[PDB]
Amino acid sequence: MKVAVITGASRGIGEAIARALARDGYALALGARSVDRLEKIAHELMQEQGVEVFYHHLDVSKAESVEEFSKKVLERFGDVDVVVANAGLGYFKRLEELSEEEFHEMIEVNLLGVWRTLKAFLDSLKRTGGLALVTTSDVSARLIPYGGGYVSTKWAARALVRTFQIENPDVRFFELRPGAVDTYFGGSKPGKPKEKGYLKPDEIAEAVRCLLKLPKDVRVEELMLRSVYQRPEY
Amino acid sequence: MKVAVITGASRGIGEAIARALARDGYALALGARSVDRLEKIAHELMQEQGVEVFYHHLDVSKAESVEEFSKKVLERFGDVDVVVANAGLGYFKRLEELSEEEFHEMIEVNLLGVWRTLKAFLDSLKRTGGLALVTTSDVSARLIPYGGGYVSTKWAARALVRTFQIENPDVRFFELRPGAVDTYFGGSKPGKPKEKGYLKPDEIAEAVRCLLKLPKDVRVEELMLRSVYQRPEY
Amino acid sequence: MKVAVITGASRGIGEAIARALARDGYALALGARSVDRLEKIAHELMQEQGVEVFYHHLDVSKAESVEEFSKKVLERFGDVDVVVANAGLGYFKRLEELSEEEFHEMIEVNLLGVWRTLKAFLDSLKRTGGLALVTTSDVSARLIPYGGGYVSTKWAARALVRTFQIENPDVRFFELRPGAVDTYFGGSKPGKPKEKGYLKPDEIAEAVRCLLKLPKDVRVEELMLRSVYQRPEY
Amino acid sequence: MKVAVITGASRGIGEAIARALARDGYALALGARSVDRLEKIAHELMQEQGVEVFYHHLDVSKAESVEEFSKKVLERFGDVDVVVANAGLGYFKRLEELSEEEFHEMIEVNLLGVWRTLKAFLDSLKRTGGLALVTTSDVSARLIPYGGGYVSTKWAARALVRTFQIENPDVRFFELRPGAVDTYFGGSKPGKPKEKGYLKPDEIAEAVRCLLKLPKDVRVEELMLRSVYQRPEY
Ligand SMILES: NC(=O)c1cc(O)c[n+]([C@@H]2O[C@H](COP(=O)(O)OP(=O)(O)OC[C@H]3O[C@@H](n4cnc5c(N)ncnc54)[C@H](OP(=O)(O)O)[C@@H]3O)[C@@H](O)[C@H]2O)c1
Ligand SMILES: NC(=O)c1cc(O)c[n+]([C@@H]2O[C@H](COP(=O)(O)OP(=O)(O)OC[C@H]3O[C@@H](n4cnc5c(N)ncnc54)[C@H](OP(=O)(O)O)[C@@H]3O)[C@@H](O)[C@H]2O)c1
Ligand SMILES: NC(=O)c1cc(O)c[n+]([C@@H]2O[C@H](COP(=O)(O)OP(=O)(O)OC[C@H]3O[C@@H](n4cnc5c(N)ncnc54)[C@H](OP(=O)(O)O)[C@@H]3O)[C@@H](O)[C@H]2O)c1
Ligand SMILES: NC(=O)c1cc(O)c[n+]([C@@H]2O[C@H](COP(=O)(O)OP(=O)(O)OC[C@H]3O[C@@H](n4cnc5c(N)ncnc54)[C@H](OP(=O)(O)O)[C@@H]3O)[C@@H](O)[C@H]2O)c1
Structure with missing residues (x-):
């Protein structure tokens, strides 16, 4: 029996990871701001996949929300095995057009939210030799026009993840670097065709x-994957 | 229904990939200099996994060998779906102690070998929208003392793979970056425990x-993975 | 004939740059929170180097301060030729011990400060084909234990500077990446010997x-330099 | 009195560096294949700059040529202070079009030539706390279509230089990363306007x-500079 915590679990990549891990029998602890969505997913996975699911409001932009979430998760399940620090957002504007508010929100979620998430479960993961997966972006290590605020936070997150790894060699840290994904990311909605990238x-x-099925001694550090319909840029 | 070519298939990572892909029912085309080893692996996989296996001598340090190998593979199977450019070797010495011969051999296998392999199958992979996996190393993007020769060829290989990808957006190139693996690499033999790193x-x-089970529109570009017992260095 | 704006000009690297550019006859616009220090530096350079010097309070953590500073500079001199976005600070603790306040302050100065500085002068620099120098760090592209907060903001700054450059090909952006420097940085005081690194x-x-003496068509993008007494780490 | 060795000194960047260092009074040891050119430069610099100049045939693609060159240089001057490993060449073709010969030549000059150059003077530079400058390219750390052979060797050279640095912390290694330069590089001739990039x-x-005028305790590790007329790509 293994326990996976997933932030940003209410839709998109986080929801998908919850569903996939449920298929392998993980107990799940779900957090996001959209509690209605979390409840809906949780009921479905409990019944259809026969896993235990816990869910709780989580706003990773708020220190006290992360702290309370982690306290409740740890109370519910004991120590965790997997933490998926996935919540993120992007605003895309030329850097002189990007607002203070937009840049701050991205920093609070994509960078500090990750930091808060990981530190809250850190002692637990150290005990379990666990795995913290952080969904950054392929743009954690390249640049895009209009991406300056977003990209800067994803480079910062990459550095943060690797630094957590250096500082905690007893835990496994996995940077997940997707390209464009058909979600609500960037003010959009699912339903976009694969062919548009x-x-x-x-x-x-x-x-x-499927990588999480590897033995506990394997540390997958980095995975970058994009659609064949996205131009391969570096 | 699908055909995987694997270089350095006689032992270590390449043999293991051949075995894993045979479990998924891939037809295999194996190349290495140790034909005895290839024949032994091939008969086993044909019987035990029910897959078609072709094998042929391949020395990736020799242009003519790679060309002949590829011609024979293509004749046997038609177009290929997966090409695993895995052959490689390392000599570890301070840069002033490394010999001309050692450096050239590493260049010829780790860089020019990869190049020859991918170019020989490039038109085929373009037709099939196939996948070229290259086993570089985690040191394709970091440095180690005593590794200057080895590392420099792996940095070169990374640039090569990425350039192939930019030049051929109709093919999927996957850079596989393992840390230390228990094989014959670096003058050793298998049997070294996980705990030594x-x-x-x-x-x-x-x-x-398991990443090769993803749909054909998914382009896994990079995977870096290491033992938990290997110090996390970047 | 040319005008250089320098943030964090009250001490350390920024003061030194002000002094060096004054030797070359640049007019200077100095910003920092320590106005006493700026006035003292300004009077000296005006008399001893014969250059025009303007100074004004600047807190790069505050949008309104940067906007006012830039307005006053532009009023005083017209367009600027060089903008040195140098203000910065570091707190060094394991990521789980670093405080919310420490992390936010680093974000606000090292990342958002730079952003505010460059955006305030961007239209000016576009007119003059000018040069924006940002003092990041050698750790804008490597990791250190205890530096996760600091480093993450410097990785973010690097991405920011490069994105500014891609978005504004009519301006020259120069990322200056020093190693350890004997200043007040990291809670210290000048006087530390070279030999300690x-x-x-x-x-x-x-x-x-001396790089700023190059012709205007030359774009110095990156300079990384460290003491011989600092271990060469990447 | 200081001694600078320069490879690829017969034209372009290497010749220019010889001329600039002559202006600062360095004794010079020049190597390239074009001995007539070297003699012409040497006579000019001896008379006009009053420096000592030694020159000798050097083909960095040949181990024995590098060895003999270094022996003769060290015999002439004693220990050296600066070694500029600058010889290089580029062929630009899609990777499946690039010939064996072209790729080998680039490897022999851009990678192994550098290695041979640096190792030959390594003991000398260790004694003098000297500076080895290697002219790689801005493409030592990015990619270009048609550049696969060239770029791969420049990534390899970057790794080599940094590895020499890790292995020899008593010597200063400087990677010089120009963009396009108006030389004979790439089958061209000088006279190309700045405006074409x-x-x-x-x-x-x-x-x-001007960076070589810094004190001996300063280690300039990396300098990347391009024309404002070259698109800023990363
Ligand atoms: N999709 C892409 O194209 C693309 C490309 C790429 O390179 C990287 N990425 C990265 O992929 C990861 C998942 O994004 P993705 O699944 O594609 O986006 P979307 O469908 O918008 O779901 C966002 C989820 O985050 C949650 N969330 C948001 N704020 C929160 C908060 N304060 N506190 C807690 N949770 C918060 C939000 O939930 P809610 O709170 O209920 O609104 C929702 O579950 C991010 O790190 C991206 O940067 C994406
Ligand atoms: N193991 C590690 O620690 C570690 C760490 C890391 O970061 C990256 N890697 C990388 O993993 C890849 C597979 O190596 P690995 O499995 O660990 O090594 P080993 O057990 O020695 O098997 C070598 C295979 O290559 C073949 N081969 C050799 N020369 C050849 C030639 N000229 N032509 C054709 N094939 C040639 C050789 O076959 P044979 O020709 O019959 O002698 C054998 O099948 C390499 O790229 C590494 O750089 C490893
Ligand atoms: N020294 C190193 O070891 C090392 C290593 C490395 O890799 C990178 N770096 C980087 O070098 C740059 C200059 O720092 P450095 O000269 O070494 O540090 P220090 O002597 O503390 O002077 C800091 C200056 O910044 C100013 N300043 C601070 N907050 C401000 C604010 N909110 N608004 C406006 N200005 C603000 C502060 O002025 P004041 O406002 O009057 O208190 C003072 O003038 C930074 O980006 C480092 O990250 C350093
Ligand atoms: N110019 C650019 O656009 C650009 C862009 C970039 O990113 C990097 N780079 C890099 O800049 C450095 C100097 O190149 P650059 O000055 O621009 O090129 P060019 O005018 O062709 O002079 C080449 C010199 O090398 C010598 N040389 C050649 N083979 C030799 C051998 N076997 N042994 C010894 N020497 C050999 C040759 O002399 P010779 O032997 O008499 O024919 C000549 O002096 C290289 O590392 C580039 O990769 C350039």
């Missing part, structure tokens, strides 16, 4: 699930 | 197999 | 000055 | 000279 979240979640 | 080839091959 | 600010400022 | 070698050599 998008992965589907269920493909990503399947990449994840 | 080694992944096992069958772990690398299962990560590969 | 420190460059002196006047060495960094002379590297800058 | 080119630096002039004398600008590069001036960047170099």
Whole structure:
């Protein structure tokens, strides 16, 4: 029996990873701001996959929300085995057009939210030799016009993840670097065709699930994957 | 229904990938200099996994060998779906002690070998929208003392793979970057325990197999994985 | 005939750059929170180097301060030729011990400060084909234990500077990446000997000055320099 | 009195660096295949700059040529202070079009030539706390279509230089990363206008000279500079 915590679990990649891990029998602890969505997913997975699911409001932009979430998760399940720090968002504007508010929100979720998530479960993961997966972006290590605020936070997250790894060699840290994915990311909605340059979240979640089946001594550090319909840029 | 070519298939990571892909029913075309080893692996997989296996001598340091190998593979199977450019070797010495011969051999296998392999199958992979996996190393993007020769060829290989990808957006190129693996690499023999800082080839091959089950529109570009017992260095 | 704006000009690297550029006859616009320090530096350089110097309070953590500073600079001099976005700070703790306040302050100065600085002067620099120098760090592209907060903001700054450059090909962006420098950085005071692994600010400022003498068509993008007494880590 | 060895000194960047260093009074040891050119430069610099100049045939693709060159240089001057490993060449073709010969030549000059150059003077530089400058390319850390052979060797050279640095912390290694420069590089001839995307070698050599005036305790590790007329790509 293993326990996976997933942030940003209410839709898109996080929801997909929850579903895939449920298929392998993980107990799940789900967090996001959209509690209605979390409840709906949880009931479905409990019944259809026969897993235990816990869910709780989580706003990773707020220190106290992360703290309370983790306290409740740890109370529910004991120690965790997998933490998926996946919540993120993107605003895309030339850097002189990007607002203070937009840049701050991206920093609070994509960077500090990850940091808060990982630190909250860190002692637990150290005990379990667990796996923290952080969904950054393929743009954690390249640049795009209009991406300056988003990209800067994803480079920062990459550095954060690797630094957590250096500081905690008893835990396994996995940077997941998808290209464009057909989600609500970037003010959009699912339903966008693969051909317009998008992965589907269920493909990503399947990449994840199947790597998480590796033995506990394997540390998958980095996975970058994009649609064949996305131009291969570096 | 699908055909995987594997270089350095006589042992270690390449053999393991051959075994894993045979479990998924791939037809195999195996190349290495140790034909005795290839024949032994081939008969086993044909009988035990029910797959078609072709094998042929291949020395990736020799242009003419790679060309002949590829011609014979293509004749046997028609177009290929997967090409695993895995052959490689390492000599570890301070840069002033490394010999001309040692450096040239590493260049010829780790860089020019990969190049010859991918170019020989490039038109085929373009037709099939196939996948070229290259086993570089985690040191394709970091440095180690005593590794200057080895590392420099792996950095070169990374640039090569990425350039192939930019030049051929109709093909999927996957850079596989393992840390230390328990094989014959670096003048050693299998049997070294995980705890000394080694992944096992069958772990690398299962990560590969399961990522190769993703739909054809998914382009896995990079995977870096290491033993938990290997210090996390970047 | 040319005008250089320098943030964090009250001490350390920024003061040194101001002094070096004054030797070359640049008019200077100095910003920092320590106005006492700026006034003292300004009077000296006006008399001893014969240059025009303007100074004004600047807190790069505050949008309104940067906007006011830039408005006053532009009013005083017209368009600027050089903008040195140098203000920065570091708190060094394991990622789980770093405080919310420490992380936010680093974000606000090292990342958002730089952003505000460059955007405030961007239209000016576009007119003059000018040069924006940002003092990041050698750790804008490597990791250190205890530096996760600091490093993550410097990785973010690197991505920011490069994105500014892609978005504004009519401006020259120069990422200056020093190693350890003997300043007040990291809660210290100047006077630490070179042998303990420190460059002196006047060495960094002379590297800058002399690269700033290159013709206007030359775009110096990156300079990384460290003391011989600092271990060469990547 | 200081001694600078320069490979690829017969034209372009290497010649320019010789000229600039002569202006600062360095004794010079020049190597390239074009001995007539070297003699012409040497006579000019001896008379006009009053420096000592030694020159000797050097083909960095040949181990024995490098060895003999270094022996003769060390015999002439004693220990050296600066070694500029600058010889290089580029062929630009899609990777499946690039010939064995072209790729080998690039490897022999851009990679192994550098290695041979640096190892030959390594003991000398260790005694003098000297500076080895290697002219790689801005493409030592990015990719270009048609550049696969060239770029791969420049990534390899970057790794080599940094590895020499890790292995020899008593020597200073400087990676010089120009963009396009108006030389004979790439089968061209000087005279190309700056506006078509080119630096002039004398600008590069001036960047170099002036950084080489820094104290001996300063280790300039990396300098990347391009023309404002070259698109800023990463
Ligand atoms: N899709 C792509 O194209 C693409 C490309 C790429 O390179 C990287 N990525 C990265 O993929 C990861 C998942 O994004 P993705 O699945 O594609 O996006 P979307 O469908 O918008 O779901 C966002 C989820 O995050 C949650 N969430 C948001 N704010 C929160 C908060 N304050 N506190 C807690 N949760 C918060 C939000 O939930 P809610 O709170 O209920 O609104 C929702 O579950 C991110 O790191 C991206 O940067 C994507
Ligand atoms: N193991 C590690 O620690 C570690 C760490 C890391 O980061 C990356 N890697 C990388 O993993 C890849 C597979 O190596 P691995 O499995 O660990 O090594 P080993 O057990 O020695 O098997 C070598 C195979 O290559 C073949 N082969 C050799 N020369 C050949 C030639 N000229 N032509 C054709 N084939 C040639 C050789 O066959 P044979 O020709 O019959 O002698 C044998 O099948 C390499 O790229 C590494 O750089 C490893
Ligand atoms: N020294 C190193 O070891 C090392 C290593 C490395 O790799 C990178 N770096 C980087 O070098 C750059 C200059 O730092 P450095 O000269 O070494 O540090 P220090 O002597 O503390 O002077 C800091 C200056 O910044 C100013 N400043 C601070 N907050 C401000 C604010 N909110 N608004 C406006 N200004 C603000 C502060 O002025 P004041 O406002 O009057 O208190 C002072 O003038 C930074 O980006 C480092 O990250 C350093
Ligand atoms: N110019 C650019 O656009 C650009 C862009 C970039 O990113 C990097 N780079 C890099 O800049 C450095 C100097 O190249 P650059 O000055 O621009 O090129 P060019 O005018 O062709 O002079 C080449 C010199 O090398 C010598 N040489 C050649 N083979 C030799 C051998 N076997 N042994 C010894 N020497 C040999 C040759 O002399 P010779 O032997 O008499 O024919 C000549 O002096 C290289 O590393 C580039 O990769 C350039």
